[PDB]
C-alpha cells in the first residue's frame, strides 16, 4: 500500500 497521506512523512 502506497498511502499518499504518508508521503510528506517520508520527505520530512
Amino acid at each position, epitope marked *: 500500500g502506497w*498511502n*499518499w497521506f504518508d508521503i*510528506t*512523512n517520508w520527505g520530512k
Partner: antibody
Amino acid sequence: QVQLVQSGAEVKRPGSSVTVSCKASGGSFSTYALSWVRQAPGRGLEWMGGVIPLLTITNYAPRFQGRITITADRSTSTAYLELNSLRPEDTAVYYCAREGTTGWGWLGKPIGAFAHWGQGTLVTVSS
Amino acid sequence: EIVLTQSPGTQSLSPGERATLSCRASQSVGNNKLAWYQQRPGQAPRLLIYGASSRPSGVADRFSGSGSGTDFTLTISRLEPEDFAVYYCQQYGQSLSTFGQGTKVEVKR
C-alpha cells in the same frame, strides 16, 4: 502559526466552473499536504482530494476524478481548487485544510489528519 | 472505498455526562489512521484526535480516542456546554480518505 485564508463566497451558473483559492502563511507551504473538503447544506464532510506542492502530487477522490483540478502556487503559498460542470448539488461550503504537525512550532512531523482549516467558501450554483 | 459508520447518528445526553461515540469501518484502517473532528454550527471542523488515540496540544484532555482495525471510539469524559456539537471520524489509512456521516451530541432535557 498556520493560517489559511480562502477567497470570498461566489454564485456560479449551472455548467460553469468555479475556482476557490486558499492562501497560507506560517509553517511550510511546500512540504505539507493540502486537502479540500466540502459540506453541502445540512450534510456531512466530504474529502474531495489534496495536493503536496513540492512534487505536484495530486490525489483525487474517485467521485470527483474528471471534474476536479487542484493546483499549488509555491511563489504565493496559494492552493487552488477547480470544480467543473457545476450542478445545484455542488452548492456547498468548500474548505481547504492542511495536515497538522507534532511537537512545538509548526515544522514538526506531519500527522496526515487535518489540523489547519480555512474559513470555508460558500459556492452557490444557481441561475 | 472504506465506509465509516457512525451509529447512532444522534446522542441526547445531559450536561456533565460521559459520552462514547462509535465509528466502525467496512474494512481494516491502515496503520490506525483514524481521526476525529468537532464541528459547531457556522464553524469549520476542528481536529480532536488523530492516529486513533493521539490528541494534539490544545485539545481538552477530556476527549480521548481508542480502538484499532475496524472498531474505534471517541470518549468524552464529561460533557461541558461547548462539547455539544457534531463529531466526525475520518480514515486516511489509504489514498482515498473518507469521513463518517457524523454523530450529533445534543442536550437532553
